[PDB]
C-alpha cells in the first residue's frame, strides 16, 4: 500500500517585460549597466534595441 | 506583466515666419547673407521674394 504521494512541487512561471529610453552619447568603450541578475534562477528572454536618433 | 511604458517623447512643432525689406543694388555676383542655420534640426519651409522696384 502506497504511503504518501511523491506528487510535484508546482512552479509559478514569471514572464515580465521591461522598457526604457536613454540618451546615448560616446562612452569611450565603457558599457553602461542596464540590467543585472542577483538571483540563483535561470533566466531566458529576448532583448531588443531600437536607435531612433537622427539618421547618419 | 508590463513594467513601465514605452510611451513617446512628444515634440513641439515650431512654425515661425520672418519678413524684411532691403535696398538691393549691384553686388557683383556676391550673395548677401539673409538667413543661416546653426542648429542640428531639419528645417522646412517656403521662401518668397518680391521685387517692388521701378519696372524696367
DSSP conformation letters of B23-49? -----TTPPPP-----SSS--------
A46: Cα separation from own chain's centroid: 8
**What does the buried/exposed string (b/e) look like for A5-32 if buried means 16 or more CB atoms within 10 Å of the residue's CB?**
eeeeeeeeeeeeeeeeeeeeeeeeeeee
CB distance from A55 to chain B under 8 Å?
Answer: no
CB-CB contact of B37 with B43 (8 Å): yes
Cα torsion A17, A23, A25, A27 to 10°: value is: -50
The chain B residue lying nearest A55, using CA atoms, is B42
Write out the three cell numbers for A17: 517585460
Bridge partners of residue A18, in order along the sequence:
B3
- Choose among B3, B5, B42: nearest Cβ to A16: B3
Amino acid at each position: 500500500a502506497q504511503i504518501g504521494n511523491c506528487c510535484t512541487e508546482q512552479l509559478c512561471c514569471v514572464n515580465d517585460a521591461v522598457c526604457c529610453t536613454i540618451i546615448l552619447d560616446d562612452t569611450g568603450g565603457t558599457a553602461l549597466p542596464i540590467w543585472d541578475d542577483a538571483t540563483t534562477f535561470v533566466i531566458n528572454g529576448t532583448i531588443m534595441v531600437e536607435n531612433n536618433g537622427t539618421v547618419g
